[PDB]
Structure 1
Amino acid sequence: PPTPHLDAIERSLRDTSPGLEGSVWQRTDGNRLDAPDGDPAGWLLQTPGCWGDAGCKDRAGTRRLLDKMTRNIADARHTVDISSLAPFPNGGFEDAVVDGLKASVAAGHSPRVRILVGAAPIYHLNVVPSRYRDELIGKLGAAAGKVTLNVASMTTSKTSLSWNHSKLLVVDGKTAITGGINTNKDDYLDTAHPVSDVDMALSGPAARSAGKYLDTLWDWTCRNASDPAKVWLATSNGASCMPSMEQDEAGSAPAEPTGDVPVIAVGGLGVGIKESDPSSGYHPDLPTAPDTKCTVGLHDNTNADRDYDTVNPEENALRSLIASARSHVEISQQDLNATCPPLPRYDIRTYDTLAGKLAAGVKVRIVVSDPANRGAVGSGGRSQIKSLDEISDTLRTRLVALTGDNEKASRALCGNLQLASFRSSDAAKWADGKPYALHHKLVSVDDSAFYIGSKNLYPAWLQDFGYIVESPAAAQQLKTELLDPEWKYSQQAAATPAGCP
């Protein structure tokens, strides 16, 4: 079985970050999409999972995510590895950790547990690591004696806005859940307008790869615990920081297959962890002309930093995933554009790749979160755009900058682009009046290869992680459970680009 999309991404990643192969990105064979019995698409964890129901009475998707997290932790023999954006998991998220950990202890195990959150320099942490660690020890009751805890919150660059954005659950380095879902009860659980998001669950060698990525974050984090402006660290039972928990657990045995699925695991170290990949001979010709409509304040790591790319291979893995589309690509994001300033408006190479696809006849679908979600410049608006025109206009400028002609441009753009804001039912907004907020970080290509993870396509310099899966069978499951429904309701809010029928 040929993996033409994965090959191209592997080639881009080894040219970009060879030194990080085995830690920040790794391709593996023999994985299984970890679906339950009698539900072969159960590996895809959507929330809330209530297509066609503007009232969202039955959050079956939410239910499956929480049970699947509880079960994965209840099966823990040795290690539980959790990362997110702050806060530390609360609500039903914390319950899943608690109930799973008690179950594990009951089976006679002594689980070691790392819990890592990223916090922006602006953000005040209410429940701080030591308070959270006390809370877990509290809720675990008598089982706390057999649980080794490392709890940390981290910021890696205050002046370049970089902290952990990855969303991972890894057990025994054998199972991994990942996606866009932060362990935050107010966005997903206790809401009449819950955010639309998706995780995926699998097992096998690629779970260890997510384990090694977390070892890389925790080697930085344990070490920088000496700079308390960057790291707040709390352990339990007077325990060491455990910067190599996944490596210690994997030992010398290679990971064991559990299925027949080939995966590339891929992440980024953001800014402030590792300056460059010293083993890298990556030397791109960077986008020589950025856009008029905005000028970066900060130094532009997305469009103008070769080193940043060497320690953030996820950037080029997304570009290559899209570049590898031969027939069609679907893109389901919170945004393609970032708030500018401070951050650059968009990723030039990403747009030029898509523009190229439109010029070639490859069909491009983009569903982003409703611009009605937008606020100001930061925390409060789940849309960094004022209008979908800001996406299609940019595809025009790049298409023109490609074909010179503008008639070639409008033929490429108007003939091949679908652009819409996300809808999950017929109604334009939730029953309680708030708009649909879409938090997907999803790219699917030729119904063969797809990415599910935490890296948005819009510029952001955080630490992130995800899986790129090549599997026609699995991409068909993705198409059926997520993409086709998404378009069924989202085409109502489609936008015909400026200059077309």
Structure 2
Amino acid sequence: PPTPHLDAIERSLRDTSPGLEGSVWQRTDGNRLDAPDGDPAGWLLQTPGCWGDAGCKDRAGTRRLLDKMTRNIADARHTVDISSLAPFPNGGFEDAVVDGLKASVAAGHSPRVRILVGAAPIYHLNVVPSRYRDELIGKLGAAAGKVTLNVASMTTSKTSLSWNHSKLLVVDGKTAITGGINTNKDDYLDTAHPVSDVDMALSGPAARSAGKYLDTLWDWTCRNASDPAKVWLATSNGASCMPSMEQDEAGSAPAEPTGDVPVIAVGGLGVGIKESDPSSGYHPDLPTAPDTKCTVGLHDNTNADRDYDTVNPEENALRSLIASARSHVEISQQDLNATCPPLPRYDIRTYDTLAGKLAAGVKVRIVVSDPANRGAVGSGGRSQIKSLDEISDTLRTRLVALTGDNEKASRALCGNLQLASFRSSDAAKWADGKPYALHHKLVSVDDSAFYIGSKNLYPAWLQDFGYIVESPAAAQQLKTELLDPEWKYSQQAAATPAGCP
């Protein structure tokens, strides 16, 4: 079965980051999207799960996610690997970890557990690694003695604003859950205005790839625990730091296939873990584009740093995913643009890819969080634009720089772009009064290949991770369960760009 989209992406990754293949990115065959019996699209873990339910009273999606987390952890024979943005998992997310670990120990297992959060320099951690570890030990009760814990919070670069943003639960290097959902109660559980988000669950070789990716983060984390300004670390039972837990579990035997799905796992190392992939011949012609709307204070890693690309293959992976689109591309994000300054306002190569698609007659849909969303920098659901015009005006600009004249740009823009704010029902706001907040990091292309992960399309220099699936059948499920409903309701909040019918 042909995989023309994964093939193009694989070429981009082998060109950008050849030395990171097998660790920070990896293509594998033989995966299974991990759906429960009698719910074939159940591998797609949407939250809160209230399409066309403005009141959203039975938040069945959140319950299905927490249940799947607990069950995966309950099945752990050897290793549990969790990463998140700070804080450490709390609320129902912590209940899932505790319940699943107690069940695993009850079944006779002595699991090793890594829990990694990234922390912004401005963010004050209320519950520090030693306190979180003590809290888990108490909740684990008698089972604590059989559980080997590594708990760590980390910041890889204070000046370039880089820390772990990946959101992973890997069990035994066999199952993996990833997506945009942060494991903290205040965004998804304890709230009447819940953020809209999506995770995906799979099993097979691509779960090991995510494990290998976490081994790269923990190799750095264990070494840099010598610098407490960068790493706070706590272990239990006198355990050592476990930098290579996933590799030790994997062994020498290659991962066993569990289905027939081809998957590209891909992440990035942000800034401050590794300066470049020094086996890489990557030599891009980096775009000359200005922006009389903003200029960065910090050196622009997104738009003007060859080295950063080579240790952040996920940036080019998303670009080449969009560039592989021969018929249509759906983008569903919190944001396309970042707050500038301190970060660049947008990723020039991404917007140039999109404009090229528009000019070639490819359909482009962009759904972002409502600009009405004001929140602090770390808020799930915030918006970094004041109006959707900051997206179409940017495409309009990149279109004239491409084509030559402005009405050629208008025919591309007005006839091929759908641009809207997220809605999940007929209500413009939650019943709560507050607006809908969108936290997806999702791209889907030609109803055949899609990314679900933690890497936003707007500029950010964090450590991120996600999966690119190519599967017409799975993308059909994605279309039915998420994209078609999203457009059904978001189109009520559509934008008509400046200069269009």
What TM-score, normalized by structure 1, do the two folds share? 0.99
Tell me the CA shift for residue 179 of structure 1: 0.1
Q: What is the CA–CA distance in structure 1 between the aligned matches of 2:269 and 2:481, rounded to whole Å?
A: 32
* Contact 2:376–2:382 under 8 Å retained in 1: no
- Larger mean CA deviation between 378-387 and 131-140 belongs to 378-387
Distance 1:29 1:378, change over 3 A: closer
* Contact 2:381–2:437 under 8 Å retained in 1: no
* Contact 2:195–2:381 under 8 Å retained in 1: no
Distance 1:305 1:224, change over 3 A: same
Q: What is the CA–CA distance in structure 1 between the aligned matches of 2:379 and 2:286, rounded to whole Å?
A: 31
**CA-based RMSD:** 0.8
Q: Secondary structure at the match of 2:213?
A: helix
* Contact 1:374–1:386 under 8 Å retained in 2: no
Q: What is the CA–CA distance in structure 2 between the aligned matches of 1:61 and 1:363, rounded to whole Å?
A: 30
Tell me the CA shift for residue 377 of structure 1: 6.2
**Structure 2 match to 1:237:** 237
* Contact 2:381–2:439 under 8 Å retained in 1: no
Tell me the CA shift for residue 381 of structure 1: 7.0
* Contact 2:187–2:380 under 8 Å retained in 1: no
Deviations 1:135-193 (A, max 9, x none): 00000000000000000000000000000000000000000000000001010001101
Q: What is the CA–CA distance in structure 2 between the aligned matches of 1:277 and 1:433, rounded to whole Å?
A: 48
**Structure 2 match to 1:99:** 99
* Contact 2:314–2:465 under 8 Å retained in 1: yes
Tell me the CA shift for residue 289 of structure 1: 2.0
* Contact 2:369–2:381 under 8 Å retained in 1: no
Identity of aligned residues (%): 100
Q: Secondary structure at the match of 2:19?
A: coil
What TM-score, normalized by structure 2, do the two folds share? 0.99
Unaligned runs of 5+ in 1: none
Q: Which residues in structure 2 correspond to 1:185-196 (within 5 Å)?
A: 185-196=185-196
**Structure 2 match to 1:436:** 436
**Structure 1 match to 2:365:** 365
- Larger mean CA deviation between 334-343 and 286-295 belongs to 286-295
Tell me the CA shift for residue 375 of structure 1: 4.3
Q: Secondary structure at the match of 2:248?
A: helix
Deviations 1:431-468 (A, max 9, x none): 00011000000000000000000000000000000000
Deviations 1:109-137 (A, max 9, x none): 00000000000000000000000000000
Tell me the CA shift for residue 376 of structure 1: 6.7
Deviations 1:201-220 (A, max 9, x none): 00000000000000000000
* Contact 2:109–2:146 under 8 Å retained in 1: yes
Tell me the CA shift for residue 374 of structure 1: 2.5
Deviations 1:331-367 (A, max 9, x none): 0000000000000000000000000000000000000
Equivalent pairs counted in the alignment come to 501
Tell me the CA shift for residue 290 of structure 1: 2.0
Distance 1:312 1:294, change over 3 A: same
Structure 1 stretches of 4+ moved >2 Å: 374-381
Tell me the CA shift for residue 291 of structure 1: 1.3
* Contact 1:115–1:150 under 8 Å retained in 2: yes
Distance 1:138 1:338, change over 3 A: same
* Contact 2:381–2:438 under 8 Å retained in 1: no
* Contact 2:48–2:60 under 8 Å retained in 1: yes
Distance 1:381 1:58, change over 3 A: closer
Tell me the CA shift for residue 12 of structure 1: 0.2
Distance 1:387 1:376, change over 3 A: farther
Tell me the CA shift for residue 418 of structure 1: 0.1
Q: What is the CA–CA distance in structure 2 between the aligned matches of 1:265 and 1:376, rounded to whole Å?
A: 30
* Contact 1:290–1:348 under 8 Å retained in 2: no
Distance 1:379 1:43, change over 3 A: closer
Distance 1:443 1:380, change over 3 A: closer
Tell me the CA shift for residue 380 of structure 1: 8.3
Deviations 1:43-95 (A, max 9, x none): 00000000111110111111110000000000000000000000000000000
Tell me the CA shift for residue 499 of structure 1: 0.5
Distance 1:380 1:254, change over 3 A: closer
**Structure 2 match to 1:479:** 479
